[PDB]
């Protein structure tokens, strides 16, 4: 059951794909690889076909390719990007060179939505709900996205949302304890991101649009107050604690003064997401039970994920061993039902 492939050259890139993928139109390149928009004649969907660039040129890249394929193959949730297909033209491991990934082609991200209409409070509830729904699932497999932001959130005409682009304007949504490497971060780094996204959808302004890391950190600390003793004790870097102790202390602001005219339940949830100490931020699963989502919360329709074995991260392997493991993941892929 190996498909028929056809080979063509678009840009300076060669594409060898099964003939089910028609009218390949290049949509750009980068470190993530070349991407073409295409038509999937088997499912009738428009898809993105992503060809990885140099997936096995180093130990580092070969392991990175394996990590990506394992992760994408595990994500099965209606609010998270899923893998429609993965393929190689190679008929054997010894021919194995190229990896292609296929996803549903996403027609608009959250920024494109905001540029075409004014969102209602109900739109915001549903968008944020779906982010938190997806995160509960991601976090339940001990995955941290690390890079939530509006450009990584796809939205369709029915206002249905999907989390895209798992990690490994760029800093504005990032938690302060990883923007400056204060500590080993938990998954509530993503909850901070959701807070920044939510505040921006409500006010129409970026919450913390700092230029450099320091300028940004001061805007954050102006809203949420400077770290107290309990948080300082959790910061590993002696230099970080010394920098923090040099700052003039600042109390937390009253958010109702910052977000005047927003649904008080929305403001209340933001207060629970944008807490400086990550150990006290609301989790995705708790946040779904917040009164703000009462129209959408359904405890029996907020699934968790299967356990995700990441013990490969501590394996020290040869470049061709990472390449062989990736090949197994390619040949063992089962497509989703439809």
């Amino acid at each position: 059951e190996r498909p028929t492939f056809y080979r063509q050259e678009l840009n300076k890139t060669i594409w060898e794909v099964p003939e089910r993928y028609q009218n390949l139109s290049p949509v750009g390149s980068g470190a993530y690889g070349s991407v073409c928009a295409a038509f999937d004649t088997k499912t009738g969907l428009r898809v993105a076909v992503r060809k990885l660039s140099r997936p096995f040129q180093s130990i580092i890249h070969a392991k990175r390719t394996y990590r990506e394929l394992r992760l994408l193959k595990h994500m099965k949730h209606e609010n998270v990007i899923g893998l429609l297909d993965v393929f190689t033209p190679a008929r054997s491991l010894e021919e194995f060179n190229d990896v292609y990934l296929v996803t549903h082609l996403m027609g608009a991200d959250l920024n494109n939505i905001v540029k075409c209409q004014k969102l209602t409070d109900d739109h915001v509830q549903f968008l944020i709900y779906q982010i938190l729904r997806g995160l509960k699932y991601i976090h339940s497999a001990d995955i941290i996205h690390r890079d939530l932001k509006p450009s990584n959130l796809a939205v369709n005409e029915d206002c249905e949302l999907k989390i895209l682009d798992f990690g490994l304007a760029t800093r504005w949504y990032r938690a302060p304890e990883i923007m400056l490497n204060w500590m080993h971060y938990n998954q509530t780094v993503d909850i901070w991101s959701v807070g920044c996204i939510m505040a921006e959808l409500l006010t129409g302004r970026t919450l913390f649009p700092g230029t450099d890391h320091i300028d940004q950190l001061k805007l954050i600390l102006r809203l949420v107050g400077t770290p107290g003793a309990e948080l300082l004790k959790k910061i590993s870097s002696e230099s970080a604690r010394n920098y923090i102790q040099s700052l003039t202390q600042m109390p937390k602001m009253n958010f109702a003064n910052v977000f005047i005219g927003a649904n008080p339940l929305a403001v209340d949830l933001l207060e629970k997401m944008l807490v400086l100490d990550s150990d006290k931020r609301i989790t995705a699963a708790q946040a779904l039970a917040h009164a703000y989502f009462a129209q959408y919360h359904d405890p029996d329709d907020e699934p968790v994920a299967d356990p995700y074995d990441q013990s490969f991260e501590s394996r020290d392997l040869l470049i061709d061993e990472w390449k062989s493991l990736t090949y197994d993941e390619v040949i063992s892929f089962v497509p989703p039902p439809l």
Binding site: G107, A108, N156, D158, C159
Partner: peptide, 8 residues
């Protein structure tokens, strides 16, 4: 969500 969001 019933009425259609606008797409660019």
């Amino acid at each position: 969500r019933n009425p259609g969001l606008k797409i660019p």
